[PDB]
Amino acid sequence: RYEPVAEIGVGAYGTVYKARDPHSGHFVALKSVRVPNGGGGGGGLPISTVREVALLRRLEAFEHPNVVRLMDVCATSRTDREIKVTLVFEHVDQDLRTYLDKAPPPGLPAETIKDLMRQFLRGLDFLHANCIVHRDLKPENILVTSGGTVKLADFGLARIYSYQMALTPVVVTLWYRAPEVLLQSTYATPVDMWSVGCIFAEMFRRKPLFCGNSEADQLGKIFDLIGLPPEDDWPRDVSLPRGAFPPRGPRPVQSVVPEMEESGAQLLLEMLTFNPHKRISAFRALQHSYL
Amino acid sequence: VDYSVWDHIEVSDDEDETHPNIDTASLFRWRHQARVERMEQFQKEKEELDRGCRECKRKVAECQRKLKELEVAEGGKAELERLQAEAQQLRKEERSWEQKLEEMRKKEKSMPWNVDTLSKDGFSKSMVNTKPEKTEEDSEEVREQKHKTFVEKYEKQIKHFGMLRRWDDSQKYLSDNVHLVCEETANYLVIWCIDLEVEEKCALMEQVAHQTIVMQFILELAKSLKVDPRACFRQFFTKIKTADRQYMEGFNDELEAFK
Amino acid sequence: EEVETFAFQAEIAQLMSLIINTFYSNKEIFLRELISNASDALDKIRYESLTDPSKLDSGKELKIDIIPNPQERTLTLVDTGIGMTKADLINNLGTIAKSGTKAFMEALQAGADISMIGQFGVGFYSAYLVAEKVVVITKHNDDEQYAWESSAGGSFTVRADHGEPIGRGTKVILHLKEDQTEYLEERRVKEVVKKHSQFIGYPITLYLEKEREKEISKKIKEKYIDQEELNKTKPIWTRNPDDITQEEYGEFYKSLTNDWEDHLAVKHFSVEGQLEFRALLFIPRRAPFDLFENKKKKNNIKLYVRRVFIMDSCDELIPEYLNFIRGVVDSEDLPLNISREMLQQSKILKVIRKNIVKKCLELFSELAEDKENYKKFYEAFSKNLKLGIHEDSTNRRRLSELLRYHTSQSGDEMTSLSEYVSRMKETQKSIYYITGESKEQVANSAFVERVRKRGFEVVYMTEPIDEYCVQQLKEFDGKSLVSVTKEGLELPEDEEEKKKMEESKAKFENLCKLMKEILDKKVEKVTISNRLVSSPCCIVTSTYGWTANMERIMKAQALRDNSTMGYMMAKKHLEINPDHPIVETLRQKAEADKNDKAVKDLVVLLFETALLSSGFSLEDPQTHSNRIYRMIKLGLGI
Amino acid sequence: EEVETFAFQAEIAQLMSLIINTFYSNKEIFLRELISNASDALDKIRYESLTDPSKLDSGKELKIDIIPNPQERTLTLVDTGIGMTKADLINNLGTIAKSGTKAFMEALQAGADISMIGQFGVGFYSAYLVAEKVVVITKHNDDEQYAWESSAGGSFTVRADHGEPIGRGTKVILHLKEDQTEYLEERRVKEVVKKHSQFIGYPITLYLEKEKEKYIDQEELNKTKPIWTRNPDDITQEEYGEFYKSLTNDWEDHLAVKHFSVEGQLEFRALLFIPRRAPFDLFENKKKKNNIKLYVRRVFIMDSCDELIPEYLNFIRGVVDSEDLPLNISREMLQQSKILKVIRKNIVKKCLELFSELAEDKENYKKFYEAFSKNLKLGIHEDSTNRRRLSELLRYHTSQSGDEMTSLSEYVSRMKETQKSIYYITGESKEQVANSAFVERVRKRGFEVVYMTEPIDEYCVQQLKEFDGKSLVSVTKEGLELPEDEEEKKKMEESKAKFENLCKLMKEILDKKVEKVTISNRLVSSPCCIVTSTYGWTANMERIMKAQALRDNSTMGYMMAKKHLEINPDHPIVETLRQKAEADKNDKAVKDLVVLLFETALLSSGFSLEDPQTHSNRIYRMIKLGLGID
Ligand SMILES: Nc1ncnc2c1ncn2[C@@H]1O[C@H](COP(=O)(O)OP(=O)(O)OP(=O)(O)O)[C@@H](O)[C@H]1O
Ligand SMILES: Nc1ncnc2c1ncn2[C@@H]1O[C@H](COP(=O)(O)OP(=O)(O)OP(=O)(O)O)[C@@H](O)[C@H]1O
Ligand SMILES: [Mg+2]
Ligand SMILES: [Mg+2]
Known part of the structure; x- marks a missing residue:
């Protein structure tokens, strides 16, 4: 009630501040305590701060002229919380997979995806700057927060799945793994982006871009969109029977993937391109006008 | 004048090197892993280079023994020359393994500092303060010495408490002067009030009496809770800031009775 | 020598x-x-x-x-x-x-x-x-x-x-x-x-x-x-405020921080005193996701010396509750140390802060005129306002003026406390309000029934931070605030009706006594209040301290379960509505037989539901539901 | 030239x-x-x-x-x-x-x-x-x-x-x-x-x-004299106690002390102290973090515990006296702050060792834990790398315990040979969760649950996904798995058919109040109960998160877990309702009862009640009917 102007040291009533009575001008200790209500014993309103301050106002009624007491007819909030202010925050468990389960039918707002895309790629630039190796990064290792922020976690099998995990982390359809994974080579910027490139298409479709069985068969689905050449555009690190993959044309990503704006179709096609050296870096894609 | 020795410290959990789109809960774990893998690779390499060096060393050492033997051999000097060249190559190989080891030494010099390279566990000694042996002292015998010297030692400080009025100042005061939370203090305050009455200092007497019952209040529920008053005096100011008008006045009534 | x-x-x-x-x-x-x-x-x-x-x-x-x-x-x-x-x-x-x-x-x-x-x-x-x-x-x-x-x-x-x-x-x-x-x-x-x-x-x-692309031009x-x-990005505060328009100023904001949207509210600050400096204040159109992540280092207000970034210690440059205003402070008169990484004599920044805050308050006041964007501002940073109110003692004289609430007379329209006050009745000498878990809760609370019947406007409050601000703000424009949830809710009313209530108290005197005995160690005082209309009874809070909405807030939010405070800070009072059919019946039943356990059990039921209706937790909800199930079985012939 | x-x-x-x-x-x-x-x-x-x-x-x-x-x-x-x-x-x-x-x-x-x-x-x-x-x-x-x-x-x-x-x-x-x-x-x-x-x-x-x-x-x-400079093996408990008391100004001596020194490129000596009681201002956001002070050659440099130690360890008092640090020309500031991070890490390791040894001393550990379990749980929440170590220090009351807490590993040692998960229940009080319907069948099946009665436990358990190879499961959520005898399973499927149309009716009655209506053997004494979907906040988490003054309300759109009405087919009420559905599924009185039962279950299950007034109004109406008022 009183108009606060200054501050008294910290003690029983915490940070006791100092006010003046809006009407009489009398000074007062702006004492404060946290305020709950009931407990395990039922409701309430456990003894009584609800009249403790009445004591303090009773002391004011006595005017006993040495009664520093709590301001106004309530246990005023003058820096409350015991007294002691403390914060605690919740971890976000909103898995990208959950996002997609909560997401709408094929044609997921390209602009939303653009924002999440550039967040992802920006995250990658950091990860590439820190040489973070994680060819095993899959949709479920991507966190999408309630504020619409992409966060990356679980950087490769070396430090993940320390507790109960999948029995087919690799056997499962690897439609989200780069050809370089399917070729049994290694991790690279293009590998990472190939993975998420399909994920981005999944986001647009709310449904995996490709879906094969074996690594070669998975490529057999991949090739249907990006196109296929014979054994003359294959990398050295190839475990798959390169050259035994009958050549075929590409299928305009723009038309295949729902709401895939041509600029993003180009970025995706570049991310999906079989040859890792014909792909686009996270930085280049990040800085592309599409995003 | 030169602290460059600490310009290359690597910290795997460095929270000042993070990113908005990265979950560092696992990134830091990745960094740990990378550090370990790199050390394993480094150590492997060094050992293999050392091995190779020692092998070529032994090979040329034995060849040199053989060179002496071929020199001695009656016509073995033709073979000697052949072996000399081979021994030279073995020495050159040894050398190149050592040159690689020198490069490993250079790599060690370039190595980042961390909890495994900066230092070792020079000394560690734990201790849990269990005890000091279930016992008990006669508080009257303690008082006989304490009341007489403690009160005089802290007489002014006891009086300073008696001169307080704000509930918060009383808490902080005893928080700073925890050794004053006892009966000897309260007893002085009672005696002091009597002396103040005699000296016609009733205004002060009344305030001292207020603080007298504050110390008595601390003693009151400390006994009820079966705990050392100094361990819970802060809960009396917590109780005071929380207890009902009717019941805190009732606690003040019980308090006045306790005194 | x-x-x-x-x-x-x-x-x-x-x-x-x-x-x-x-x-x-x-x-x-x-x-x-x-x-x-x-x-x-x-x-x-x-x-x-x-x-x-x-x-x-x-x-x-x-x-x-x-x-x-x-x-x-x-x-x-x-x-x-x-x-x-x-x-x-x-x-x-x-x-x-x-x-x-x-x-x-x-x-x-x-x-x-x-x-x-x-x-x-x-x-x-x-x-x-x-x-x-x-x-x-x-x-x-x-x-x-x-x-x-x-x-x-x-x-x-x-x-x-x-x-x-x-x-x-x-x-x-x-x-x-x-x-x-x-x-x-x-x-x-x-x-x-x-x-x-x-x-x-x-x-x-x-x-x-x-x-670049490989120089094979084919491409290059x-x-x-x-x-x-x-x-x-050029200095803006260096130019004349009157000659600075939003076509460039808004662009500055967007370059100030990565935000592809013009600011919400801004304030140029020109200081020509000893500490000569100029500063630009920027209020975002929306709160940031991490707004309350106080674990993070602040960097909204930055300190430049001679247009050179030196410090960004917002902890000193601004108040915690103003940690949403982004801006630039530029002085050429500052005593930086030899490293130029830290300003000597921090008392300088203490003065600078105070001066800036004054302009923040003036900005807020300017915004108050633009009700449309004010409401946008207010809602975006209402918590920050209330935090300032909560923490910044000195400036609550301006911050409390910025408060806006929904009331029983404004309904869905959020209005000023000054508007509330200006529209108070000649008997309405105190501001009536209610806090709770939600709008529709407090809007249908038993506590505001008579209050509305007496023609009083009730300010509806729902945030935990509101629950702080009501403890803090207990007077505005000369008239104190009274929660309708509290005991001693002296509404202005006809003395003759007060006499009727006293006669009712005599009528239900024995009932109140009996109920208190029934609810011994459950409730401190069972009594009568005309604040109730449709309800037979109601657990009511006391004039001070802990209230219906407060446990939810502090008991669960505070990390320190200060069990002393948890066990030393709340009574319980039960209001009775003497006009209610059940209450009337209970009197009759008490008179018929005060020892009728069935009646006593009914009182306990009503007590527990009084707790529920007022937003209180039960000591064992399962036994409450068990009684309910028992009553159901009786209705079903089970 | x-x-x-x-x-x-x-x-x-x-x-x-x-x-x-x-x-x-x-x-x-x-x-x-x-x-x-x-x-x-x-x-x-x-x-x-x-x-x-x-x-x-x-x-x-x-x-x-x-x-x-x-x-x-x-x-x-x-x-x-x-x-x-x-x-x-x-x-x-x-x-x-x-x-x-x-x-x-x-x-x-x-x-x-x-x-x-x-x-x-x-x-x-x-x-x-x-x-x-x-x-x-x-x-x-x-x-x-x-x-x-x-x-x-x-x-x-x-x-x-x-x-x-x-x-x-x-x-x-x-x-x-x-x-x-x-x-x-x-x-x-x-x-x-x-x-x-x-x-x-x-x-x-x-x-x-x-x-x-x-x-x-x-x-x-x-x-005041240096103690870490002395040979620790020659320092008595009384001396360590006096140092602590002098260090902290606490009349009470420490619970535990540990000397720690490192040698090499980094070199220092130090004393770490565990206090017997927590400070009243332990969690104050504005409190100076100076519990452990930093010295060079016994010369005070700084005491920034914000970086020296973890926040969840911000109660340990002590002194760290280095031999040689890269102090700036202004000794008050230290160059290469990464050094402090290294020191931190070394300290943390030793604190954890001390905690483990303290745990060996059950009696004093109990005292410690009671005072600083909050900090422990904060460590579980905050520290992703030492969580496992910290989880060994956790102690809870369980079904098979009395008022004595027990570790998660002790829980594990008492798990059944077919038990693949740790059963637990969270809430406001031990009695509340002890009387929960969710643990009744669990007890009938011979299982122990972990009682979690602190608000922080919602954040702690969020991180406690698996312990010693054992998974964890809340009895309050959907999908609670308890031993299923094939005979009983058949009977349950028969019961599902028996009350199939009843559940459908209830759903029609409460279409927008409950996501799914179904029977479940998790219930024993109760006719029904509301459960929380595995996705989103628990009833407890909802209540707790709603408390936060600074919470962004729009985040609930991602956290509002689905509610389902569990039905216990063995009760006369449920059976009656089935019979009443057969008699007349359009019977309004029956429908009202269904609504009543739902709110009754929801409320007693710990879920937020939409309108306490209307709920009690129904009650008042029923009371009036019992009284014969109207
Ligand atoms: N690029 C430059 N062009 C001209 N003069 C320079 C240049 N760099 C250094 N100087 C000389 O150095 C002098 C001061 O430079 P220096 O930065 O060392 O001191 P300062 O700039 O006055 O303040 P500070 O020492 O804090 O930078 C200048 O007056 C000039 O004589
Ligand atoms: N009490 C003393 N007795 C004898 N000589 C002294 C005393 N105090 C200072 N000196 C002399 O003062 C000189 C100036 O040294 P100064 O103390 O300024 O540098 P320092 O303090 O040793 O270095 P730093 O700046 O790192 O403290 C030293 O050479 C030292 O011999
Ligand atoms: Mg210069
Ligand atoms: Mg010197």
Whole structure:
């Protein structure tokens, strides 16, 4: 009630501040305590701060002229919380997979995806700057927060799945793994982006871009969109029977993937391109006008 | 004048090197892993280079023994020359393994500092303060010495408490002067009030009496809770800031009775 | 004895190493100080050419260029500034604690608008933090081209013109250390200069190997990058506020922070006192996701000295509750220490803060006029307001005026407490309000029934932070605040009806007694209040402290389960509605048989539901539901 | 020729003004620097006397005397060191960035136990931050007594002193500036002493004009002694207790203490202390994090526990005294903060070891845990790398326990041979969760649950996904798995069909109040109960998160878990309802009952009640019906 102007040291009533009575001008200790209500014993309103301050106002009624007491007819909030202010925050468990389960039918707002895309790629630039190796990064290792922020976690099998995990982390359809994974080579910027490139298409479709069985068969689905050449555009690190993959044309990503704006179709096609050296870096894609 | 020795410290959990789109809960774990893998690779390499060096060393050492033997051999000097060249190559190989080891030494010099390279566990000694042996002292015998010297030692400080009025100042005061939370203090305050009455200092007497019952209040529920008053005096100011008008006045009534 | 006089000496051999090694912790200042020196030299020209245009006959363009050379592991700073003479290289550049900017400080009596940045005469030597060797090739118009050269080894040299065309300013050759190659990276260069040369008057460009398509043109892209962009953001507060429009000011905000949307509310602050400074305040159109992540370091209000980023200690620059206003504070009168990383005499910032806060409050007041955008502002940062109200004692006289609430008379319209007060009745001497878990809860609370029947307006409050603010704010515009949830809710009413209530109290006197006994150790006081209309009874809070909404808040939010406070701070009172059919019946039933356990059980039921209806938790909800199930079974014939 | 060579120069006139204006920020540190220099000189004596004891003939006492003089507004500092020769006064004292401490340290290269500081060579000039003029009077054992006078005006003078003799050492006269008289205050002096001189090896005394107003020798000014410098094996519990009490000013001694030192490129000694009780301001956001203080050579540098230790460990008191850190020219700041992070890591490891050993001491651990389990749980929440270690320290009450807490590993040791998960229940109170319907069948199936009654447990359990290979499961969520006898399974499927249309009816009645209506054997004594979907907040988490004043309400759109109505087909009520559905599924009274039961279950299940008033109004109506009112 009183108009606060200054501050008294910290003690029983915490940070006791100092006010003046809006009407009489009398000074007062702006004492404060946290305020709950009931407990395990039922409701309430456990003894009584609800009249403790009445004591303090009773002391004011006595005017006993040495009664520093709590301001106004309530246990005023003058820096409350015991007294002691403390914060605690919740971890976000909103898995990208959950996002997609909560997401709408094929044609997921390209602009939303653009924002999440550039967040992802920006995250990658950091990860590439820190040489973070994680060819095993899959949709479920991507966190999408309630504020619409992409966060990356679980950087490769070396430090993940320390507790109960999948029995087919690799056997499962690897439609989200780069050809370089399917070729049994290694991790690279293009590998990472190939993975998420399909994920981005999944986001647009709310449904995996490709879906094969074996690594070669998975490529057999991949090739249907990006196109296929014979054994003359294959990398050295190839475990798959390169050259035994009958050549075929590409299928305009723009038309295949729902709401895939041509600029993003180009970025995706570049991310999906079989040859890792014909792909686009996270930085280049990040800085592309599409995003 | 030169602290460059600490310009290359690597910290795997460095929270000042993070990113908005990265979950560092696992990134830091990745960094740990990378550090370990790199050390394993480094150590492997060094050992293999050392091995190779020692092998070529032994090979040329034995060849040199053989060179002496071929020199001695009656016509073995033709073979000697052949072996000399081979021994030279073995020495050159040894050398190149050592040159690689020198490069490993250079790599060690370039190595980042961390909890495994900066230092070792020079000394560690734990201790849990269990005890000091279930016992008990006669508080009257303690008082006989304490009341007489403690009160005089802290007489002014006891009086300073008696001169307080704000509930918060009383808490902080005893928080700073925890050794004053006892009966000897309260007893002085009672005696002091009597002396103040005699000296016609009733205004002060009344305030001292207020603080007298504050110390008595601390003693009151400390006994009820079966705990050392100094361990819970802060809960009396917590109780005071929380207890009902009717019941805190009732606690003040019980308090006045306790005194 | 004989008094001998000695001059103080200096062990330069040690001193030099201390300058390099012990003066700085952050090697990023390398480029900052180098650029600063270049801009000082450019300022020197500006003055000289200002008073004498022929001073530009050997070059008019004023700028700072940075060219990295990875193939050498060196950096080149191109200073198109006035440069130095041979004597200056020897005297100024080659002397510790020596600066020619002081000469300009004294010489420029006419050049009052020429502000040199810094003046210690030692920052140059910080170059050797990351450089093995530095060569400064320069040609001041009053001398020839010379190549100053040193590795900071206790000596330096000066060489004659080597033919590398420098007719103005200087070429600083920075030979980087083996382990300082990160400063050859575009990214790294940009990271540093963006934090230190942000508002340099003269444009800074980088000459970088341009990432490009293979030169097979078939395709080909440009070979080099001209990164002028580094200084695309100019000082705004330096111009006249009246001549600054949003077409540029809003753009500044968007460049101030990565936000592709103009600001919500802004305030230019011009200080012409001892602490001369100018500042721009920016309020976002929405709160940030991490707004309350106080674990993070603040950086909204930044402190610049002579347009150079020095500090961003918002902890000192602004209040915690104002940690949403982004902006720039720029002063040329600040006493920075030798490192220029920290302002000496923090009391300066204490004054600066107070002054800024005053303008924040004025901005908020200005916003209050624009109800549309005010409501947008208010809702975006209502918690921050309430936090200021909660924490900032002194300025609540302005912050409480910014409060806006939904009431029983305004309904869905959020209104000012001043509007509330101006519309108070002649009997309405106190502001009535109610807090709770939600609008529809308090809007249907038993506590506001009579209050509405008495024609009083009830302010509806729902946030936990509101629950703080109601404890704090208990008077506004001369009239106190009374929660309708509290006991002693003295509504203005007809004395004769009070008499009727006293007669009702006599009527239900024995009932209240019986109920208290039934609810012994459950409720402190069972009594009667006409605040209730449709309800037979209601657990009511006391005039002070803990209230219906409060447990939810503090018991669950506080990490410290201060069980003393948890067990020392709440009673319980039960109001009775003497006009309610059940209450009437209960009286009759008590009179019929006060020992009728069934009636007693009914009282307990009603008690528990009184707790529920008032937003209180039960000691064992399962037994409550068990009673319910029992009653259901009775209804079902089970 | 084409190049000229020059030595680097220094403009001392400006340099000096920089020294006493820009090199320092705080000014009270002038005592630290001058006292430090005294202790360096006192160590010089000690060493020299080790080789030649007759050097102690000119006084055998090593100390620092502080004598304020308000009548002049000056401060006399008497340093009983060796002293400075005339040459030293003009060479070392009168030279910037130069100290003979190093020369002495060069003498000490022959082998010594001597430890001095002073690698910058400028500390002396900090005196002029506060003093207008400084006079240094000294008498070296190998020279005469000389007065050295300067106001830092670019020059200084030296003359042989007269009058009072100095056996050895030097006296510093601080002609304090008119606005620096605050340093004549006892409190102010002691403040600085306690700030940076609390562990100076030599006696520092403060003379005060007190009863008869004469200079009283405050010998106890720095009576506090270093303990980590002593051999830990020779330090008793009483000594560790006294140190803790002196360190923290807590009358109560510590719960536990641990000495810790590292050697190598990083080198330090330290004492860590666990307090027996938590502080009333433990979680205060504005509390200075200075529980453990940082020293170099027993000289206070800083106490920034914000980086030194984890926030969840911000209760451990102690001292870390390093041997050699990269202090800035301003010693108050340390270069290369990554060093502190390394130190932190080493400390954390040792704290965890101490905690483990404390856990071995069950009785004191229980005491510890009761006081600092909150911090432990915060560690579970915050620290992703030591969580596993911290989880071993967790203790909860469980079904098979009394009021005695038990570890998760102990729970695991009592798990059934077919039990693949840890059953638990969260809530506001032990009694609340003890009476929950969710643990009734669990008990009927012979299972133990973990009782979690603290709000933080929602954050803790969020991270406790698996323990010792065992998964964890809440009894309050959907999908609660308990042993399913194939016979019973068949019977349950029969029951599902039996109450199929009943559940459909209930859903039609409460279509927008419940996501799914179904029977479940998780219930025993209750007719029905509301469960939480595995996705989103629990009823408890909802209630708790709603408490947060600073919570963003829009995040609930991602956290509002689905509610489902569990039905217990074994009750007469449920059976009656089935029969009533058959009699007339459109019976309004039955429908009202269904709604009643739902709200009854929801409320008693710990879920937020939409409208307590309307709920109670229904009750009042039913009461009126029982009373015959209307
Ligand atoms: N690029 C440059 N062009 C012209 N003069 C320079 C340059 N770099 C250094 N100097 C010389 O150094 C002097 C001061 O530089 P220095 O930075 O060392 O001191 P300062 O800039 O005055 O303040 P600070 O020492 O804090 O930077 C200038 O007056 C000038 O003589
Ligand atoms: N009590 C003393 N007795 C003898 N000599 C002293 C005393 N105090 C200071 N000196 C002399 O003062 C000179 C100046 O050194 P100064 O203390 O300024 O550097 P430092 O303090 O040793 O280094 P730092 O700046 O790191 O503290 C030293 O050479 C030292 O011999
Ligand atoms: Mg400069
Ligand atoms: Mg010294």
